Amino acid sequence: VPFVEDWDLVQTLGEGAYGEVQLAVNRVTEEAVAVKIVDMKNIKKEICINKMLNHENVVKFYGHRREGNIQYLFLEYCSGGELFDRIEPDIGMPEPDAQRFFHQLMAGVVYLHGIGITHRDIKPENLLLDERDNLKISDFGLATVFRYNNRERLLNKMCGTLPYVAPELLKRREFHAEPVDVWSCGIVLTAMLAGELPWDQPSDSCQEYSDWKEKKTYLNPWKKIDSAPLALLHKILVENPSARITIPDIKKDRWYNKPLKKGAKRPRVTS
Ligand SMILES: O=C(O)c1ccc(-c2cncc(-c3cccc(O)c3)n2)cc1
Structure with missing residues (x-):
């Protein structure tokens, strides 16, 4: 399948200290994931721990890719957002x-x-x-x-x-x-x-x-x-x-x- 590896970044889900998390949608399949973008200019340990995690009540880690000094962690998209916003x-x-x-x-x-x-x-x-x-x-x-x-x-x-x-x-x-x-x-x-x-x-x-x-x-x-x-x-x-x-x-x-x-x-x- 040509193009299955292309994700469009469509929306910011949150800024942070590290940088920024984007909602990414697959061009072919329309699968949505969160992409955590961290400017390295700490993360190896986070990735390493993330590679260990497989549980339905823990955000799934799909993999990572680095392009120069920018690391891209691919993570489970959680459309309900933060629990914080369910608390009145x-x-x-x-x-x-x-x-x-x-x-x-x-x-x-x-x-x-x-x-x-x-x-x-x-x-x-x-x-x-x-x-x-x-x-x-x-x-x-x-x-x-x-x-x-x-x-x-x-x-x-x-x-x-x-x-x-x-x-x-x-x-x-x-x-x-x-x-x-x-x-x-x-x-x-x-x-x-x-x-x-x-x-x-x-x-x-x-x-x-x-x-x-x-x-x-x-x-x-x-x-x-x-x-x-x-x-x-x-x-x-x-x-x-x-x-x-x-x-x-x-x-x-x-x-x-x-x-x-x-x-x-x-x-x-x-x-
Ligand atoms: O590893 C992380 O830091 C991390 C993993 C997943 C997300 C993620 C995954 N899905 C949705 C949202 C999100 C977060 C806040 C608001 C909102 O509408 C969506 N955030 C964020 C950070």
């Missing part, structure tokens, strides 16, 4: 939507952790939605290996996004990777259910974080959250990463297992 400021979203998105997030994060990868920057801006509203973890630019040859490596680089970062990343020289991603998921869950972030950062100097540790859940955002998901958040947003709930135990949580959402509305008729 000060409101959140319907609890059954949040639960479903949270289920899919855990699935992605379990997968990543199982192959020894930590994302390190989980937040609604990086969680994308496909045409069926399936959640996809995107952007492995900050990601790293925390397990190799069945041997865990402790992290020491501070990175991520302050409102989503776990307190230990600010307090300790070294920390385990997995509890940090769990914490960020908890912040994402809070945002989905309240449409606001609980604190600027999880530090002793942040009054809102102090209020949470003092269990003042009569305040916002917590007063907006039903008691069942709030009981889960109490187990996730635990300052001590060694006492913080793990994902296997999240999967056992009462709200996590609460029937809330009917299946995707399929067509039907009556007589």
Whole structure:
């Protein structure tokens, strides 16, 4: 087939630090993909990690091509955009939507952790939605290996996004990777259910974080959250990463297992 390798770049999906992500459509097949364009004038590790990833709740990597000093990563196109834009400021979203998105997030994060990868920057801006509203973890630019040859490596680089970062990343020289991603998921869950972030950062100097540790859940955002998901958040947003709930135990949580959402509305008729 002549021309199958030609993609037209038709729309900008986002500017970034690295550069820019474009929606690309195949000239022949009309298959759409996202093309991440990074001006090298870091990326080898992102590509390398991306080559490892194969999961329905993680953005698929198709390959890459370099043309001089410009790298082109070919990635799954997610037409639903960012989860961020499904969160209504000060409101959140319907609890059954949040639960479903949270289920899919855990699935992605379990997968990543199982192959020894930590994302390190989980937040609604990086969680994308496909045409069926399936959640996809995107952007492995900050990601790293925390397990190799069945041997865990402790992290020491501070990175991520302050409102989503776990307190230990600010307090300790070294920390385990997995509890940090769990914490960020908890912040994402809070945002989905309240449409606001609980604190600027999880530090002793942040009054809102102090209020949470003092269990003042009569305040916002917590007063907006039903008691069942709030009981889960109490187990996730635990300052001590060694006492913080793990994902296997999240999967056992009462709200996590609460029937809330009917299946995707399929067509039907009556007589
Ligand atoms: O690896 C990355 O950094 C990356 C991977 C995929 C995308 C991607 C893939 N599909 C859609 C969108 C996107 C992002 C924001 C808004 C929007 O309408 C679409 N973004 C972006 C970055």
